[PDB]
Design an enzyme around this catalytic site. Structure first.
Site, PDB file in Angstrom:
ATOM      1  N   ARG A  14       5.224  31.238  -6.554  1.00 33.10           N
ATOM      2  CA  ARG A  14       4.964  30.688  -5.074  1.00 33.10           C
ATOM      3  C   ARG A  14       4.338  29.247  -5.387  1.00 33.10           C
ATOM      4  O   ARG A  14       4.590  28.525  -4.457  1.00 33.10           O
ATOM      5  CB  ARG A  14       3.903  31.641  -4.734  1.00 33.10           C
ATOM      6  CG  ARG A  14       4.653  32.863  -4.038  1.00 33.10           C
ATOM      7  CD  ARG A  14       3.689  33.884  -3.808  1.00 33.10           C
ATOM      8  NE  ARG A  14       4.493  35.113  -3.382  1.00 33.10           N
ATOM      9  CZ  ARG A  14       5.111  36.069  -4.269  1.00 33.10           C
ATOM     10  NH1 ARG A  14       5.123  36.026  -5.452  1.00 33.10           N
ATOM     11  NH2 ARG A  14       5.616  37.155  -3.864  1.00 33.10           N
TER      12      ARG A  14
ATOM     13  N   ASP B 280      -3.035 -10.954   0.542  1.00 32.41           N
ATOM     14  CA  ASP B 280      -3.932  -9.592   0.545  1.00 32.41           C
ATOM     15  C   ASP B 280      -5.426  -9.877   0.023  1.00 32.41           C
ATOM     16  O   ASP B 280      -6.420  -9.111   0.477  1.00 32.41           O
ATOM     17  CB  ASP B 280      -3.647  -8.657  -0.601  1.00 32.41           C
ATOM     18  CG  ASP B 280      -4.090  -7.633  -0.873  1.00 32.41           C
ATOM     19  OD1 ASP B 280      -4.584  -7.024   0.359  1.00 32.41           O
ATOM     20  OD2 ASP B 280      -4.039  -6.866  -1.813  1.00 32.41           O
TER      21      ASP B 280
ATOM     22  N   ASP C 174       0.920  -1.451  -0.092  1.00 32.73           N
ATOM     23  CA  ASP C 174       0.001  -0.115  -0.237  1.00 32.73           C
ATOM     24  C   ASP C 174       0.930   1.222   0.087  1.00 32.73           C
ATOM     25  O   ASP C 174       0.529   2.415   0.460  1.00 32.73           O
ATOM     26  CB  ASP C 174      -1.121  -0.130   1.378  1.00 32.73           C
ATOM     27  CG  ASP C 174      -2.036  -0.984   1.093  1.00 32.73           C
ATOM     28  OD1 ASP C 174      -2.392  -1.355  -0.101  1.00 32.73           O
ATOM     29  OD2 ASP C 174      -2.617  -1.676   2.161  1.00 32.73           O
TER      30      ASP C 174
END
Lengths: 83, 481, 481, 83, 83, 83
Positions: free
Chosen positions: C418, C264, C114
């Site tokens: 920015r 899983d 994950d």
């Protein structure tokens, strides 16, 4: 770090000595030559005269405080027979 | 004689697997034990307890630190096993078919180190200890009965003219003021959660051997193994059987514990330092300047020069390759004393390793632990724990009959009944089972009942997280809705 | 011929350990790899991402779930090794001195499953895909150039009269709209973090083999191994070398991956169910009623009858003892096909195991995933990701010269400067290294530069946590200070 | 669960068929006898007459959606020669 | 700092030049020898060939941007007679 | 529900009895046969010997507590002449 109960026991011993009309002087430092920490205790009276003075060395503070408290209780037993 | 088959016990307290077994069955048993440990609510509680900095960034919790301790312990265990196999002593020591259990036990002991600490850590334990010290005053029971007994409980006062009951009051009063994380962890693993672990797994988390009710000086041959409380008075019988299951004498220690302790000493330094950079406190250049001022050549010079997220990944590796073989050789050299359980020293306790660890520790103390935020969090946690204890105080002022009636079902104690219902189910069930077994006719019943009531309160207080305790403290004070 | 020495490669991409080595050196190499993986910021980021329920109680995060997947994978690997050792095939398959690396690789692959999911999971990927699909419209490039090309980028339009450059536009446009967690995990492990893992460890996390720029139908002999994208276009060369290091053909898979996939699939069900009880949604009695209605005798009846925090600890064990040996036998039975890399099925894919897993899954879908809170969180996450992409859109509207000048140092682009400075250092460095190697004279430079700019944006968006993205979204919208 | 890109491709194929003046009818269910899921697609026109109808079975939905999209593209190529 | 309107006028002139099928190349730096800031503009075409190149020096950026915009408008008038 | 003042008066009577070196034992339940609630009080001493025991039945608890308090005050007056 130092455990709370050991500090509490040391404080209780100090208070017991102080209530006995005595003075406890505490000094501490670290010695890198021996690679340890050193604590010196100097007992006095209301006038300010040395009676018993001892220094302890150790690398762990938990054992050091236990030794100091044991010594303080031993002197209290010694000098609490009278005076 | 060294034989690790007498120390790795796979029996259980309840529904124990009896008979003969092979390597595969033993491995399956220990894998099952891992399955119970990993999927426990205690670990998920570790997920949300603070290590140094307040929980926000990617700072570390208890769980991630436990994950480093586990890795270090496993690597040291593997090094020890490899070095023993090289010298052809693996089969003579009984470890030929027990390597997997060895590594698994060490890893699981490293994972369960922080299972029993209260919220806010060192400042939570201090608060509990001071509150109960004010309530009980244990220093007034060290000798013959006095007239100035400052105890606030009628049944715990030392009333001259009875010496068999006094010994018990002394023990209870001294025990109740020595809450400690490892003793609470043992109590949690056995009594509160009922995980039913193997004997070796439980022995792996017994770090210190001093009883909590101890008064006086400890023997000079055990002054290090008895520097902290090890277990409570309610587990004494249990601990006794544990010794019979592991051939341990009084005040002795289980071998593999040493390895775990060693791990808790390496990570303890380095990790903290890294987090200081991530919270924008200072930088790499300041790190080297402070280290050089507070001071070695190999690790420090290689780290500083090969560097000119990837600096620490290089700094760890060198420290591990310098420290782990030293611990392995210290374990193997003093093996008979460790197997006896009387080794009065630690593995890493005048080599350059001590100097490097002290360097890291003093830099961390100088530049990290002195930050105002840590200090403020420490004061706030102390105040919160004290306030919670003050809030739950009215439960301890009741009587035996009133509390007994309140447990079985009241109309005369609304506030007290609501406060009692606020407690968890497991703690109340533990209280019920503990009190049921007591003889209901001895003059010692009130003493034990008060002891178990205080134990119930301490379990509830210590079973919280930082955020849960903080929120509950503001809710019970009518500060927030 | 089966020989696991040709598949477990301990070489590295940079500063590889050359020469001959023994078992101990190989084990130390893999322990070092574990050391790099466990102490990474990606795991601490997993610490604060949600699994099902919002982060508060003791609900589970990504990390605790990864800790169950790791345990299951290790237990299955140990069962496989034991069964192979019993039949005296361990030495004939080249696994005599490679058991430790086997188990370590499986565990570490299970831990890194994950690592590459975006915030909010399935609803984050959907948002990114829809945003980029609206911007690029990949369905209009499948054939000869059109006049109604809806693409919003001048350089990515298919302008008839040039066939060598068109192929590249098609590839880039199709790739940019197939963000997937595993491909991003591979990119993160190799390019962004620069962990320098061994070849086998990197191959253990390659789950699917379909390229992201694929158009059309897949061969009937690979329709399962190519159901999801496997890697991006920026890693193609890398993947090529990976195959040469592991003797893998085109669209093939590394053996041990199968085991990880199996794990899983088990935990995925049971864990979710338990959390439903802890959040006070329904109770044990309702659990059994719903299970019985939606339906077996052994597990369900033993769990329901032996029970009359400890119910789930009994329910897991039976399911594991029923499922793990089946997976081990399926692995061993079809071993040559798995070692070849062409097995077009999964291990657990008509036995009672499928029925039990489907039972758990449908109960969870009926009673847990339909709760309003999950649904609300899912909508909120979608909106947050869309808003963040809209906010950072102005960076993608610039020109080649403007963005190049902005990278090297501006007075003409205050807002854009920015916004660019708000990005992380690692992603910008990755962009710089990727673009530096491009030939600055080919007519293909703008295409690649746009591709890498979009990759930079997607890395930034996917490298956040849920709380960080949410807070940043409210801050950039002037909703909170 | 189903991957987003596969659903997007299926939707794109459906839109391409619908823009071709055709109607796509979708039905789905689960068959416990075969232990799988079944999806049936029925193509129609502006009048509402069946042209091509097919059903697919599979245990994983990702492969099922890919097969459906492939069939839809195949019919679109077949019937987009003209009409 | 630079005023917004001057930057807007410079951007408008740049857009007007670019719509005229021309390319504007901007470079800037600081010269400590003359104690000023320098801006060089290089005009090009769709092929990438230099046409006009000029550099301006000043200590205040507001005047520098005004001079640059004036030069850009002058060239636009010059080369917008045709081509 | 029970009014606070009645409970306070009952507690005051209980405390007055307890300060008199006596023990008050309280038990309560519900009787569905009579369709009421029952409260039994058993007075004792420091040794644990029964002296007076009485049980009261009622359907409303406010009257029941008042009756109990009245009985407790009556016994206190009876046995507070001396001893």
């Amino acid at each position: 770090r130092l455990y709370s109960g050991n500090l509490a026991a040391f404080k209780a011993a100090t208070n017991k000595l102080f209530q006995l009309d005595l003075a406890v002087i505490y000094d501490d430092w670290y010695d890198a030559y021996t690679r340890k920490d050193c604590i010196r205790l100097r007992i006095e009276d209301r006038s300010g005269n040395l009676i018993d003075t001892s220094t302890f060395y150790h690398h762990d503070e938990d054992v050091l405080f236990n030794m100091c408290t044991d010594w303080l209780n031993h002197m209290y037993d010694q000098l609490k027979d009278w005076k | 004689q060294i034989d690790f088959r007498k120390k790795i016990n796979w029996h259980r307290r309840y529904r124990s697997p009896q008979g003969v077994k092979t390597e595969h069955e033993i491995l399956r048993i220990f894998e099952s034990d891992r399955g119970r440990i990993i999927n426990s609510p205690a670990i998920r509680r570790l997920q949300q307890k603070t290590q140094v900095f307040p929980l926000e960034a990617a700072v570390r919790t208890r769980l991630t630190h436990s994950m480093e301790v586990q890795q270090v312990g496993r690597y040291i265990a593997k090094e020890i096993l490899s070095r023993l196999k090289e010298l052809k002593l693996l089969e003579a020591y009984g470890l030929d078919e027990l390597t997997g259990p060895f590594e698994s036990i060490v890893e699981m002991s490293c994972l369960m180190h922080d299972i029993g600490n209260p919220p806010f850590g060192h400042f939570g334990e201090a608060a509990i200890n001071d509150w109960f010290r004010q309530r009980l005053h244990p220093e007034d029971a060290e000798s013959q009965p006095l007239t100035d007994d400052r105890c606030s409980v009628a049944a715990l006062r030392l009333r001259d003219g009875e010496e068999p009951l006094n010994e018990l009051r002394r023990k209870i009063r001294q025990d109740l003021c020595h809450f400690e994380g490892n003793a609470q962890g043992i109590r949690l693993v056995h009594t509160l959660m009922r995980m039913n672990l193997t004997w070796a797994q439980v022995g792996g988390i017994l770090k210190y051997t001093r009883p909590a009710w101890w008064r006086g000086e400890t023997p000079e041959t055990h002054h290090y193994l008895m520097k902290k409380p090890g277990y409570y008075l309610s587990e004494e019988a249990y601990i006794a059987r544990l010794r019979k299951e592991l051939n341990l004498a009084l005040y002795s220690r289980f071998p593999l514990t040493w390895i775990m302790e060693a791990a808790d000493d390496i990570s303890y330094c380095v990790a903290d330092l890294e987090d200081a950079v991530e919270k924008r406190i200072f930088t790499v250049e300041q790190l080297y300047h402070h280290l050089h001022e507070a001071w070695f050549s190999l690790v420090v010079e290689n780290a500083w020069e090969k560097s000119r997220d990837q600096f620490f990944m290089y700094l760890r590796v060198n420290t591990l390759n310098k420290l782990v073989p030293y611990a392995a050789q210290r374990f193997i050299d003093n093996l008979p004393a460790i197997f006896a359980g009387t080794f009065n020293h630690a593995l890493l306790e005048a080599s350059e390793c001590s100097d490097l660890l002290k360097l890291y520790k003093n830099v961390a103390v100088k530049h990290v632990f002195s930050h105002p935020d840590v200090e403020r969090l420490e004061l706030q946690g102390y105040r919160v724990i004290s306030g919670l204890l003050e809030i739950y105080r009215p439960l301890l002022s009741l009587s035996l009959s009133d509390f007994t009636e309140l447990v079985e079902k009241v109309k005369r104690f609304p506030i007290e009944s609501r406060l009692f219902h606020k407690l968890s189910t497991r703690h109340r069930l533990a209280y019920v089972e503990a009190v049921s077994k007591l003889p209901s006719d001895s003059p010692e019943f009130p003493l034990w009942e008060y002891y178990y009531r205080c134990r119930l309160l301490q379990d509830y207080i210590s079973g919280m997280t930082d955020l849960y305790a903080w929120d509950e403290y503001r809710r019970l004070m009518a500060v927030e809705q």
